[PDB]
């Protein structure tokens with residue numbers, strides 16, 4: 001009895017100039033995913049093995065399989081279209097920002113056997129304004145409805161234990177019922193996404 005209804009973006013055109021930031025956002029978001037998984041004990045693997053914690057997507061964003069790469073780009077585009085659908089304006093302010101933009105140097109033990117070492121953008125200094133933090137909460141919750149909707153449209157349903165064969169997932173629940181740990185992790189991701197706009201010189205203002 002779950003009806004995820006994301007913010008309607010069906011009438012939003014993504015201006016051609018925002019396609020770079022769109023690409024930037026997806027890449028940096030992916031790096032965070034890899035760092036988080038490595039920190040959860042995951043390591044590279046040609047094929048996914050939960051018992052061993054091998055993941056084929058622990059590579060650079062480019063080397064990602066097309067099905068997995070395109071998903072990250074579509075979600076990235078929907079994030080920007082969701083901002084636009086919410087009345088926000090996205091315009092480039094500080095062009096030199098991308099110049100003094102440095103990645104995070106993670107310990108050497110973070111490099112996988114596959115040679116991939118995650119290097120997300122160090123955006124710690126980017127302090128978000130109280131209004132921007134509200135936007136993050138919206139994007140976070142709405143990100144969950146977007147994921148859920150797609151998963152439901154592809155034959156997925158709730159289950160107590162995730163089952164790749166049965167297309168069942170315990171997180172297919174309304175945002176309110178979701179575990180706070182996951183909800184917080186998602187907000188953190190969206191928070192970095194909003195920071196990626198600042199760190200790249202763009203201004204996010206309604």
Ligand SMILES: Nc1ncnc2c1ncn2[C@@H]1O[C@H](COP(=O)(O)OP(=O)(O)CP(=O)(O)O)[C@@H](O)[C@H]1O
Pocket residue numbers: 029030033057058068072162189
């Ligand atoms: N919560 C998330 N936030 C951002 N990107 C994510 C994400 N979960 C997955 N991705 C992107 O999807 C790609 C592959 O998705 P995948 O389904 O393998 O994630 P996953 O293995 O963590 C599912 P699970 O959370 O059930 O373990 C990842 O490399 C990353 O680019």
Ligand SMILES: O=C(C[C@H](NCCCO)C(=O)O)Nc1ccc2ccccc2c1
Pocket residue numbers: 025026029030071072073075076077079143144147148171186193
């Ligand atoms: O589906 C994705 C991949 C996508 N990565 C590209 C970055 C674009 O900015 C994105 O996070 O937007 N993440 C995602 C989002 C919400 C979720 C809610 C519940 C369970 C899993 C979830 C997974």
